[PDB]
């Protein structure tokens, strides 16, 4: 298997900036490399083929170079529509192999999350289950840690985490954290705590509530 | 020079088989190999195999040999891929590609799940409820199948300050949640409603967000 080492794997860029993405092959692939891009929820769109041929319909802003093992893809001046994930494809030999992808996101000033905690609802509680929800929204950068604590101790399973992609206007991300329990064990405890770790602060950002009503 | 057209979304049962189709339009079908590629969040992109509709030659990735069969019909310029004995790990987006052009992908969901209406719960702020400038309200849509669900706040009227998180699988059923932030003045004096719709079971639910007693 030819191995494709694509780097960097994630890049924080500004509109209008020149971007360069690379792919080293574990052996010589005789320029049989494609460069494609995939936007969230959309299929792949090839940009370049045979290492340096533009594809019919692709801005001249995209250019590919390299021979042998090291290939590059340059984006001369980055536009909003270029955001997405970039991959390289070697098609010199079988099996065909891909690079891990390069994720592009717009840089911005670091923002701390706005954390909200939601005790279960009565309608859920009268059905047997109990979901405890935590919203960490509008923050930057993407890296975030969320720990759940029931009466002082960490709870690991029962947890479901979901992320939004980078927001088109403010460039921040958002995440919802759901701790799902049964009504009986939710009714066995009192102090539910959501704590998030993020680059914006030294100490965690803590949100809690007491079922006896704080 | 034109395009690849793939069959629609497939919902199958564990142990069954699917045959996916890829129609080639606008180029000489017999001069180009058609390749099948699998994509999953866990494993990323993987090559299954490929066929030359011309010579009929096929090549397979070792991992899929015995699982997948590749075929092509010259009269309909349609490449086909058969997958047998499906389990949930076969659940993916599948793509045919000419290496330059790409089909739009067919979603295969391997599940035993049955159509089930979602439970919709209104998430009101915690008791007490801060004296901040704004308030985040929420709504939790639990245990449905299959995707998708559409969710709005005030039937679309409210759309600024909303976040709707991608649905995730939990114990074989989908769960999704969404929040809205409005200023303190708005709520609860103005009512805010969570509208959920699930075409698949023809459920349409509207949920008022009242303050916690």
């Amino acid at each position: 298997d030819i191995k494709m080492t694509q780097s960097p794997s994630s890049m924080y860029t500004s509109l209008g900036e020149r971007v360069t993405i690379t792919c080293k092959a574990s052996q010589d692939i005789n320029s049989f490399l494609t460069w494609f891009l995939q936007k969230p929820g959309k299929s792949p769109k090839t940009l370049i083929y045979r290492a340096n041929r533009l594809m019919i319909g692709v801005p001249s802003r995209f250019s590919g170079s390299g021979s042998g093992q090291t290939y590059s893809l340059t984006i001369s001046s980055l536009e909003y529509e270029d955001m997405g994930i970039y991959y390289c494809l070697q098609y010199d030999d079988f099996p065909l192999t891909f690079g891990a992808g390069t994720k592009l996101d717009l840089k911005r000033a670091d923002a701390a999350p706005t954390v909200s905690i939601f005790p279960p609802s009565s309608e859920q509680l009268t059905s047997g289950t109990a979901s405890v929800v935590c919203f960490l929204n509008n923050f930057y950068p993407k890296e975030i840690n969320v720990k759940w604590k029931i009466d002082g101790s960490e709870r690991q399973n029962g947890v479901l985490d979901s992320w939004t992609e980078q927001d088109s206007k403010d460039s921040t991300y958002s995440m919802s954290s759901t701790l799902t329990l049964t009504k009986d064990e939710y009714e066995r405890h009192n102090s539910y705590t959501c704590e998030a770790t993020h680059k914006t602060s030294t100490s965690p950002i803590v949100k809690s509530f007491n079922r006896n009503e704080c | 020079q034109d395009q690849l057209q793939q069959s629609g979304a497939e919902l199958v049962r564990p142990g069954a088989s699917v045959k996916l189709s890829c129609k080639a339009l606008g180029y000489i079908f017999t001069d180009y190999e058609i390749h099948w590629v699998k994509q999953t969040p866990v494993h990323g992109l993987e090559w299954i195999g490929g066929i030359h509709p011309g010579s009929s030659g096929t090549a397979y990735n070792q991992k899929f040999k015995g699982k997948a069969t590749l075929t092509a019909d010259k009269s309909s310029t349609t490449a086909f891929m058969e997958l047998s004995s499906l389990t949930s790990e076969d659940s993916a987006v599948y793509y045919c590609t000419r290496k330059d052009y790409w089909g739009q992908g067919t979603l295969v969901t391997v599940s035993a799940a049955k159509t089930t209406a979602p439970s919709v719960y209104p998430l009101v702020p915690v008791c007490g409820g801060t004296t901040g400038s704004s308030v985040t309200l929420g709504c939790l849509v639990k245990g449905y199948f299959p995707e998708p669900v559409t969710l709005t706040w005030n039937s679309g009227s409210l759309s600024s300050g909303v976040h709707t998180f991608p649905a995730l699988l939990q114990s074989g059923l989908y769960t999704l949640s969404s929040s809205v932030t409005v200023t303190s003045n708005t709520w609860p004096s103005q009512t805010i409603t969570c509208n959920v719709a699930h075409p698949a079971s023809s459920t349409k639910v509207d949920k008022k967000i009242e303050p916690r007693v």
């Binding site: 083929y49 098609y91 | 011309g54 000419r98």
Partner: peptide, 11 residues
């Protein structure tokens, strides 16, 4: 656009 080169290894 591209020709068979695209490398048609199964020709």
């Amino acid at each position: 656009g591209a020709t068979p080169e695209d490398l048609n290894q199964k020709l």
